[PDB]
Design a protein around this ligand. Sequence first.
Ligand code: GDP
Ligand code: MG
Lengths: 47, 289
Amino acid sequence: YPRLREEMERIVTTHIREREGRTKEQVMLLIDIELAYMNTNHEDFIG
Amino acid sequence: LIPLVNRLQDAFSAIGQNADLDLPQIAVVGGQSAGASSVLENFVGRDFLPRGSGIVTRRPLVLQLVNATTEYAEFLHCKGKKFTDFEEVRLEIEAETDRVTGTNKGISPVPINLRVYSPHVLNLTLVDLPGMTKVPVGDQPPDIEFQIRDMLMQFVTKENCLILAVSPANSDLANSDALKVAKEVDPQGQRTIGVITKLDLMDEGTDARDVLENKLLPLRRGYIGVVNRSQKDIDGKKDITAALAAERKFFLSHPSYRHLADRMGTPYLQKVLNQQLTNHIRDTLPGLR
Ligand SMILES: Nc1nc2c(ncn2[C@@H]2O[C@H](COP(=O)(O)OP(=O)(O)O)[C@@H](O)[C@H]2O)c(=O)[nH]1
Ligand SMILES: [Mg+2]
């Protein structure tokens, strides 16, 4: 049903796009968190 | 009024950098003397393309629109010259065609690059291709048919490309080479739109009502009927406004098209292409935003 296949694929891909915008924030924020503090208490030479 | 997708290009022009819409390429395909170059002319709204009976389009013309505050044209040859009179553009197109192809009806694959700046032209790219023929004439080698097809198969065989199949109304639809190519490269009818050009020349006692209603050869997106300026009028220098008024009178008057009047004409074709283009950005807007 060309109309139904067109709409269904448009909707599911627009949603996957709106989610890329949220998946990439938490990756930036996890690296920022990695830079905020230096934890030398485990699995290190000193620890 | 300005449609929203045009208002976006105005806004991105105001920003001036680092943002733009991704639109498809538009290709117009048809048989010789079908009326393709009068379709591009009507669509753009400026009478700058060479037109008339016989072989005229001898090279691929890659017309590239650009949004700008002032109206003018330019070529990627003759660098730096700004053409504010489109008659000069038309003569330059003819001269550039002759410099490469020669004057004895030659055909060459090297494209002509033209760029037009204007207020509300999004960034749409249009391509004009040199018709299709069966029998060589003039200084044309025997295998010209395959070379012309090979030229077509470099544009219509790509995705992200709309196709307008142009076919005359006074020639039975079964003979159209436009539909044959569209069907071969787009079997599902996803991109193809059909244009019927010469509805005013139908032999007395016949019409194309059966084709305009998408019954005879069903095509997904239907058929749109247009009436352009005859050879006398283009030689008589009739203005586009008069041509549009005549087209509206014709469709409103013809008994077999009264009930289809609201789906026929150049402006409707513009609406159809605006909706078609608006629907190729829907899944990209979240990224822009
Ligand atoms: N009467 C009439 N003539 C048309 C119409 N459309 C195209 N033509 C004629 O077709 C001729 C050649 O068309 P053209 O633009 O060259 O098609 P091309 O060969 O693909 O470029 C033009 O001189 C027009 O006079 C139409 O709707 N009505
Ligand atoms: Mg032509």
